[PDB]
C-alpha cells in the first residue's frame, strides 16, 4: 500500500496534496465503498473498505486522511507450560491456572457438522499445542481489548479539524496502521499508530517468550513513543510499507524486512525529481510506480560491474546492456499481452538463479524455500496483491553491497567465490533459459506481461459474487486497489479542498433476480485502467448539482 503527502514547501499551485494507494488485492464487487455522511457532527466524503462506519480514505473540507499497513511488531507468542497431570491448565506466576475455553459447532451445507474447542490463556488464544513438550502457544496481540475502540477512533477522527484533534484519535486506534493527515493550510503529518507492548528487558521480539510469568509484557508503550512527524523538513511524507523511522523494528514475519533495498525509494526519486509537484504530477506518480520493475535499480549496478570487462559479442554483456538502456518502466506492446522490453523476465530469471546460488544455499532445508522467490511469481490471473522486492532479494542486496551494508555477513553468501563470478554464472543461466525460449535475437523477444484480475472471491478466498462476475484487465498495475487524491488550497480554484477517487468496478454490486446488473455495476472499470478518476463531492450544493437520484426516509428509533 502506498501514500505520498506533499506539504506546502513541495506543492505547486496548491498548499498540500495527498495521494493514497491502499493495496488489498482486486475484487468484484469493489473492495471499498464510496460514501458521504452529513450531520450529527460529520461532514465527510471518500471511500472505505467493506463500508466501515469510519472512512479510511477521505476528507472533511478541512483535513484529509489515509492509511497504509503499519507492519510494526504488535504480536508476540507465549510458550505456555502445560502439565499432563492437569489438562486444561497452565503455569503462570507460580500457580496452575485454568484455561478459558468454548465449544464451537461448524454447521455444513450438505455435510455433517463439526464441533471443536478454542482455548485461551491470559496471553491470548492458543494457536497450537505440542503434547510432546507439554507446551501450548498463545498468540498475544497488543491491541487485544481495543478492536472496537479502533473502529470508533477511525470514525471519530473524521471530525477532527486540526492536527491536535486528529492525533487525539490516532492515539486511540490500536492496530498497526500508518495514518496520514493533510489540511487546508498546507500542514501535513503522519503517525505510525497502534498499541505496542512494553517488553521486559532481554525480550527478542522475533521469537516466542516463556508464558510462565517473568516474560509477560509490562504493559503498553505510550503514544509519545509512536513514530510520528508533523511538517517534516523534506516537505513530503512517502510510504510503501517501508519503515516509519530510524531504529524502529518491523513485524517479526520472516519474509518481511525493512533494509537498504526498499520499493519506497521509487516514490522518493519521483518526488525529488522536481522542486515542486502539481496535483497532476502527484497523481502521475501512481502510473509510474505502478509500472516500475523494482529490481532494476537495485541490481543493475552489480550487473554493470560484473560485465564491464566483457567483449561486445558476449551474451552476458548484451543482457546487461539491454537493461542499461531501460528505465525499468514496463509498457504493453499493441497485442495487449507482452511487454515492450524483456528486462523484467531477464531480472526474474537472473535473480531466481542468484538466490539459488546464494541465500538459498546458505539456509537449511526446508527453510531454504523461504528465500528462493524472486518476487515475480504469479498466476495467469496475475498478482493477487502488490509487487515487492522479495525477502531473499533484500538479503542478497545487502551482500552485494559489501561493506557499504551495516548487516554483518555472518555467512558469506557467495561462499568464498568472487561475487562477479556468481553474477556472471547467473547471467549465463539467464541467457540459456531465455534464448532457449525466445531465440538469440533479444530485440524481438516479446515477454509476457502480467495481467490484473478483480476476483469474485474476497481476500479470505470466499465467494462474494458468482465466478462469472470476475473482471479482467490486460495491464497489471502495482497500485492501490482504489486511488484517492485530495488537493488543499489549490491556486486554480477558490475551493479550500478538491478531491477525486476511483472505486472499480463500480459503486454498486447489485444484480436483479432476472440478471439485470445495476447501472453503477461497472462504470468505473475503464477509468481505473486508464489512470482516470472522478470528482468526490462534499458540499450540499456540489452534491445537489451532480445528483442522480434521491430518497427521503421518515424513521423512528
Amino acid at each position: 500500500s502506498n501514500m505520498w503527502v506533499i506539504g506546502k514547501s513541495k506543492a505547486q499551485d496548491a498548499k498540500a496534496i495527498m495521494v493514497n494507494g491502499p493495496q488489498f488485492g482486486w475484487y468484484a464487487p469493489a473492495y471499498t465503498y464510496g460514501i458521504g455522511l452529513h450531520g450529527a457532527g460529520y461532514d465527510v466524503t471518500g471511500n472505505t473498505p467493506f463500508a466501515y462506519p469510519g472512512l479510511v480514505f477521505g476528507h472533511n473540507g478541512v483535513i484529509s486522511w489515509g492509511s497504509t499497513a503499519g507492519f510494526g511488531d504488535d504480536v508476540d507468542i507465549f510458550a505456555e507450560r502445560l502439565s499432563a497431570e492437569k489438562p486444561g491448565y497452565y503455569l503462570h506466576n507460580g500457580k496452575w491456572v485454568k484455561m478459558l475455553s468454548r465449544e464451537e459447532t461448524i454447521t455444513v451445507k450438505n455435510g455433517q457438522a463439526e464441533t471443536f474447542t478454542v482455548w485461551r490463556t491470559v496471553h491470548g488464544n492458543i494457536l497450537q499445542t505440542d503434547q510432546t513438550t507439554q507446551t501450548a502457544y498463545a498468540k498475544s496481540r497488543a491491541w487485544d481489548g481495543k478492536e472496537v475502540a479502533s473502529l470508533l477512533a477511525w470514525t471519530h477522527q473524521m471530525k477532527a479539524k486540526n492536527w491536535q484533534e486528529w492525533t487525539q484519535q490516532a492515539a486511540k486506534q490500536a492496530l498497526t496502521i500508518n495514518w496520514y493527515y493533510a489540511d487546508v493550510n498546507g500542514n501535513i503529518g503522519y503517525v505510525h499508530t497502534g498499541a505496542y507492548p512494553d517488553r521486559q528487558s532481554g525480550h527478542d521480539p522475533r521469537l516466542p517468550v516463556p508464558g510462565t510469568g517473568k516474560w509477560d509484557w509490562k504493559g503498553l508503550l505510550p503514544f509519545e513513543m509512536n513514530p510520528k512527524v508533523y511538517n517534516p523538513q523534506s516537505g513530503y511524507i512517502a510510504n510503501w510499507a517501508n519503515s516509519p523511522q530510524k531504529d524502529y523494528p518491523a513485524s517479526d514475519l520472516f519474509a518481511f524486512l525493512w533494509g537498504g533495498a526498499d520499493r519506497v525509494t521509487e516514490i522518493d526519486r519521483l518526488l525529488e525529481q522536481k522542486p515542486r509537484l502539481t496535483a497532476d504530477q502527484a497523481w502521475d506518480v501512481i502510473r509510474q510506480t505502478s509500472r516500475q520493475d523494482l529490481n532494476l535499480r537495485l541490481f543493475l549496478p552489480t550487473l554493470q560491474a560484473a560485465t564491464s570487462g566483457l567483449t561486445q559479442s558476449d551474451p552476458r554483456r548484451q543482457l546487461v546492456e539491454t537493461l542499461t538502456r531501460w528505465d525499468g518502466i514496463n509498457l504493453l506492446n499493441d497485442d495487449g499481452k507482452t511487454w515492450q522490453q524483456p528486462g523484467s523476465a531477464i531480472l526474474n530469471v537472473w535473480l531466481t538463479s542468484m538466490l539459488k546460488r546464494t541465500v538459498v544455499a546458505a539456509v537449511p532445508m526446508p527453510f531454504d524455500k523461504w528465500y528462493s522467490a524472486s518476487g515475480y511469481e504469479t498466476t495467469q490471473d496475475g498478482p493477487t496483491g502488490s509487487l515487492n522486492i522479495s525477502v531473499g532479494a533484500k538479503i542478497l542486496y545487502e551482500a552485494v553491497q559489501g561493506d557499504k551494508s551495516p548487516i554483518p555477513q555472518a555467512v558469506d553468501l557467495f561462499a568464498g567465490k568472487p561475487q562477479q563470478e556468481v553474477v556472471l554464472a547467473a547471467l549465463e543461466d539467464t541467457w540459456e533459459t531465455l534464448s532457449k525460449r525466445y531465440g538469440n535475437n533479444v530485440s524481438n523477444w516479446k515477454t509476457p506481461a502480467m495481467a490484473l484480475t478483480f476476483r469474485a472471491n474476497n481476500f479470505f478466498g470466499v465467494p462474494q459474487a458468482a465466478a462469472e462476475e470476475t473482471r479482467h484487465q490486460a495491464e497489471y498495475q502495482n497500485r492501490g486497489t482504489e486511488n484517492d487524491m485530495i488537493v488543499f488550497s489549490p491556486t486554480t480554484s477558490d475551493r479550500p479542498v478538491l478531491a477525486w477517487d476511483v472505486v472499480a468496478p463500480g459503486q454498486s454490486g447489485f444484480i436483479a433476480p432476472d440478471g439485470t446488473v445495476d447501472k453503477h455495476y461497472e462504470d468505473q472499470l475503464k477509468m481505473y485502467e486508464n489512470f482516470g478518476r472522478k470528482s468526490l463531492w462534499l458540499t450540499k450544493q456540489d452534491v445537489e448539482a451532480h445528483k442522480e437520484s434521491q430518497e427521503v426516509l421518515h424513521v423512528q428509533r
Partner: protein
C-alpha cells in the same frame, strides 16, 4: 426533523447521507450499503465469523474453524456493551438501517433479492451491532494487524544453530531476519527523530 434521513446518489451512484442525529446518520449508511452490496456484505459477515460452510459446504470447514480459533467473540461483545450511548448508536443505527432494507428485500424477493442469493441458495437475515463491528474486527484487526511467524522463526533459528553452531547460527539469523537495519529508507527522516528503544537481538528470553 429528528426522524428524517435524506439520501442523495451522485452520477457514479455514490450515496450522501443527511440526518440530524447519530443513529439516523448511520442508519442511512447501513441502508444504502444493503442496497448496493448486500451479498458481498453477507459473505464478508460469514467470512469474519466463520459461518461460510453453513451455505457453501465442506470445502470451507477448515477456514471457518480457523476464523473461530483466531478470536474470542464474547470479548468483542463485552467491548460493545461498554460503549456509551452515542457510540453504540453508530453500530446500532448501522445494523438497523441495513435491516430496514433487508426486511424490504425478503418481503419482495422477486424483484429485490440480489441474484447471488438465488444462485447460492439462501436468503439474508438481519444484522446486529456485533455483526457490523466484526466486519471491521474480522478484516482490519484479525487479518491485517495480526501477523506473527515467531514459531517458524524459532524453527529457523534452531536449524541455523544446528547447521552453523550456536553463535554463528544466531549471527546468521541476524543476517537473514535482522531486528533493525540502519540503511532502511524511513518515512520520517533521521533529522526529525529516531525511535529511542533498543531491543534484544540474541533471543535472551530463553538465555
Amino acid at each position: 426533523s429528528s426522524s428524517e434521513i435524506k439520501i442523495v446518489r451522485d452520477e457514479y451512484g455514490m450515496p450522501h447521507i443527511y440526518a440530524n442525529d447519530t443513529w439516523h446518520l448511520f442508519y442511512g449508511y447501513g441502508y444504502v450499503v444493503a442496497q448496493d452490496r448486500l451479498f458481498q456484505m453477507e459473505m464478508a459477515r460469514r467470512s469474519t465469523q466463520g459461518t461460510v460452510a453453513e451455505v457453501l459446504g465442506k470445502d470451507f470447514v477448515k477456514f471457518d474453524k480457523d476464523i473461530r480459533r483466531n478470536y474470542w467473540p464474547d470479548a468483542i461483545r463485552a467491548q460493545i456493551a461498554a460503549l456509551s450511548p452515542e457510540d453504540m448508536s453508530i453500530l446500532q443505527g448501522y445494523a438497523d438501517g441495513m435491516n430496514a432494507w433487508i426486511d424490504k428485500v425478503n418481503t419482495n424477493p422477486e424483484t429485490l433479492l440480489p441474484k447471488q442469493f438465488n444462485t447460492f441458495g439462501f436468503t439474508p437475515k438481519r444484522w446486529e451491532p456485533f455483526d457490523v463491528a466484526m466486519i471491521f474486527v474480522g478484516t482490519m484487526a484479525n487479518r491485517f494487524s495480526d501477523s506473527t511467524s515467531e514459531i517458524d522463526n524459532l524453527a529457523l533459528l534452531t536449524a541455523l544453530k544446528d547447521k552453523y553452531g550456536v553463535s554463528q547460527g544466531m549471527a546468521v539469523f541476524n543476517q537473514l531476519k535482522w531486528l533493525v537495519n540502519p540503511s532502511a529508507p524511513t518515512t520520517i527522516a533521521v533529522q526529525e527523530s529516531n525511535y529511542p528503544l533498543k531491543f534484544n537481538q540474541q533471543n535472551s528470553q530463553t538465555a
